[model samples]
Structures are given as C-alpha cells and as structure tokens.
Target: RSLLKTKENLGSGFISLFRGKKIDDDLFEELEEQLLIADVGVETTRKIITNLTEGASRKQLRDAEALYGLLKEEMGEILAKVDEPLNVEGKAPFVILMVGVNGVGKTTTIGKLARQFEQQGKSVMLAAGDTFRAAAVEQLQVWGQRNNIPVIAQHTGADSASVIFDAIQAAKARNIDVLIADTAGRLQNKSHLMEELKKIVRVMKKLDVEAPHEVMLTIDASTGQNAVSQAKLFHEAVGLTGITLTKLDGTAKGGVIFSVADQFGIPIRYIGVGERIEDLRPFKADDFIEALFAR
Candidate 1:
C-alpha cells in the first residue's frame, strides 16, 4: 500500500505516457516537459533527458519501453547514490538530532523512529528539546508515554540546548541504546535558532565528543521548492548527515527528492510513505524506481 500510494501521488499521469508510445523526438520532447512538471528540477530533468537521448542515439533505441527502462535506470542511479540506511550499531546511545522547519513532521518522525529503534531491541530515549513551542514538548511526552519510551524535557521556555544536554547525561547514566533529540524549527529568527542548534551540538560534545551520530532533517515532500530551500538552510546551518522525506503519499510533486539527492547527495535515510508508523521505510533505489514505473 505504501508503494502504491507513493505511485498514485507522485506524477500519476506522467509515467503512463511511456506505455504504448514510440521513442521519437516528440516523445523525448514531451518527456522533458513532464519531468519538469513533476517538479524534477531543471538541472536533473535535463540530465535525465540528456542521458536518455544520448543512449537512444548510441543504441538506436526504437521502443518507448526501452527508453522507459533507461529512464528508470537513470533515476535509480541518482537515488542509489544516497540510499544509505541509518546504522545504530557501534555507538551506545546513538544520538540523532532531528531538525526541520515548522510543521514538517519532525516530532512525528522522531516518535516513529524511536518506536522502530525500540522494536529492534534497542532502548530508545527522546529529548523534548523544542522549547519554543509550548505544546511541542507535551506532544512528544504524550507519544513517549503511550509507547512507554522515556522522554527528558524541561519547562516550555527553558534553554533548549540545556534540555538536550541533560538528556544526553541521562541517556549515558541509563545506558540507553539510542537518544533522539527534537529541536525547534522556527525560521523567524533563523540565525538565533541555528545558533541554538549549534550550541546544542557544542554542549552535547562536552559529554560525548562524537555525539549526535546523525543530524537528520525531516522534510515534507509536498512543499517542493521550499523543501529544497529548507534543506539548504538547515544543511548550511548545522550540516545534515541524513534526510527523512515525509508526506510522499500526499504530494504530486515528490520529485523534489530528485533535486535534493542530486544537489546535496546527503544520505536519504528514510521516506514516509504513509501516516502509519511502519510507513517510514528506509530508502531503496530500485524499489523506489519500480514503484515509480509501476503500471
């Protein structure tokens, strides 16, 4: 269902154009337009089109199915470059700092991630570090309680870095396997928020120099270009080590992922295919391509 849902939402009419079609100039021309419309950035769209055109000329391609195969292969290769899964081994209390813009499902992704980690026989702890939002900490605490996962939090207006710093100490004391920290995503005072995040990292280093094993940014795929902008801002701010693209099942322009992967090449750790907890599947290049081209 997750795969099918992703296919339905991502350029529903674009993939079928290759079916029962010929590999002619018209087909190639139309493909370029559709790729752009699908939110595949100009650079990436041109790259895919150029590669297919070159292959077609070199191999004397006649069938659109062959062209489609080449297209799938091209996309698969791009995604394959950053299809790394999050490895929680080798580091006790593997720290993952979740960061993103407001309402991008950062907290929800943390909950899902913590639950998934616990199910893997890892003791997980959550840090409600989003002190900017009064309800944010409460939201996370509720989730933690329901899942029976421990959450460390402070007052709503408390220093966010201190909260996470304390959480790190607690995780070390309790011998937790994973510690997922949530951070404020307000872009209003961009520099301030970024500095706070940097401070969180600096403060965490006092305990474990190699802390924050993963700085994962959760992005909503439906936002398209804005998602790329947020990626740029966050990556420049704190340097993202991984990305989790959410709302893939709710967008027609999930192609923003292509732009992200092509531009940054940050490892795409996971993708939210649905609203369910299990929907947050680790990215797989071939599986994504197969779903994209599924009839």
Candidate 2:
C-alpha cells in the first residue's frame, strides 16, 4: 500500500517533473537527480537514463509521459530478473538461516515468516539463536508462543551456534517441515560478527550435511545507500542466498532496492510495507513497479 507513495521515482518528483514542464534536457536532469538522491545508485540510474534516451531516439518515442511508462518497464524488467520466490518444496524441514545487522527487524522478520509458513500448511519451528541481545530470545519466544510454534533457545550470552544445533536435532526428531534460525544482529562490516556467523554454519552442518539451506539477509529500505553497503558485505561474508527488504513504506526512498538488486543480483524473497504480518508479502516485480509508477 505504501509503495505507491514512493516519491523517488513514482511520486512528487516524478509528478512534478512532467506536470508543467515540457520534456527536454531538464527532464532528464531532474529524473537523474531524483533517482540518485533516492539511493538508486549512480551506475543503475545512469544505465536506466541512458536506456530511455537511446530507446527514445531509436523508437521515435516522444513526450515526457510516454517516457515514464518506458522507465517503469525498464526498472521492472531489471527486478524481474531477480524476482524469484523462495521455494521449500523438496527439503522437508527446510532450514533457513536468517541474518542481518542490528535493528534491521531481523527478529521480527523471523516471527512474520514463521506465521506465513504456518499458513502455508508447513510445520514451523524457530530457534532463538540471537543470544547476543538480552531481549532477543524472549522476543522470539513470545512470537513462538503466540503462534503455537515451538522455539529452541538458550540463555542470554549462550553460544548461538549451539542453540541452532539443538534446534536442528529437535526438528529432525519431530519431523518439522521448516526450521527458521534467528541469529544475533551482526554488523555487516564487523569481522568478528562475520566469524560468528561462520561458526553457526559450521555447527549446523555437524548434523545435516546440507543444513541451513538458505542464508537470508534482511535489509531496511529506509537506510538508503547504506543498505547497499550492508548487502555487499553480508553477501561477501556468508554468501546470502535471498533477501527480505523491510519498511519499504512510501515515506522511504526505496530506490535502494534497485541498487541492492543491480549490484548483488540477490533474489528478493519478500518485502514488508507495514507492521502487520500480512504486510509481509512475496516480492513480485510487476506488482511492485506497477504500484510505484501506475497512474
């Protein structure tokens, strides 16, 4: 719902540009500036702009409004390439390792996902492996209790990896359909934190050789360009397989979603627009860009 309110490409700046002024060099300048400022990143913005300019000339396309539709097409196409949904078909008790920086809604995302998986008719269990934070375990348990999903947890300051290991063993015994393990919010750039994540991987594999099937990172859209840095480092550290972008409300400059996708090519599995569990929806390229750019 809030995505339609994005001012970066589909809101005030876009409307203001084509409202009164005729198309010209100034139109391109304003578009470029708004995209850049919205954290679209220089390379991606340039690429899109160049495509519109060249395509406009080649196809004899004219008018600012006409160009806007083409712009949406281009952005949506880029996103479509990486718009794959997370599929847990084959692996019963599919293991997903959730990682993110501090305060990026990592714990909350886990809860939301657990609820979603349950609705999909999958048996869901959570591992409160975020032992670094004092309240993380409790927060996760609350979600588990509320949803009637079991949670494997340890005391605060306990080894996060060991907790995950126990969860996996229990999941196997109970034949749980899915296990979502929550990790401490490790700073992407912190080497020690990355090392700890590596330790978690080591411990999980001690049970099932192909365990921790998915290494998913959660990023905040409001973080702007900083989110690109976070995606880069985390992808480098643990090889992120999927991403969940949260807080992509209209008030946020959601252009960073483009930069993260263009720069890393990570498949965006889900996006959160509001606080409700239902707000967390599968990332659909067509729907997202349509909501942003549709008149």
State the displacement of the C-alpha of residue 111, model 1, in Å, after optimal TM-score superposition: 0.9
Across 203-285, the per-residue lDDT of candidate 1 in tens digits comes to 98999999889999999988888888899889889979999999888666778889899988999999899888899988887
Native-structure RMSD, model 1: 2.0
What's the residue-level lDDT of 243 in candidate 1? 97
RMSD of 2: 1.9
Candidate with the greatest lDDT versus the true structure: 1
> Which runs in model 2 stand beyond 4 Å of their true positions?
11-15, 20-23
Q: Per-prediction TM-score, please?
A: 0.93, 0.93
RMSD (Cα, Å) for all candidates, in order, is: 2.0, 1.9
| lDDT (C-alpha) at residue 21 in model 2 | 61
User: lDDT of all predictions, in order shown?
Assistant: 0.85, 0.84
Q: Which stretches of candidate 1 lie over 4 Å from their true place?
A: 1-15, 19-25
In model 2, where is the ten-residue run with the lowest total lDDT? 4-13
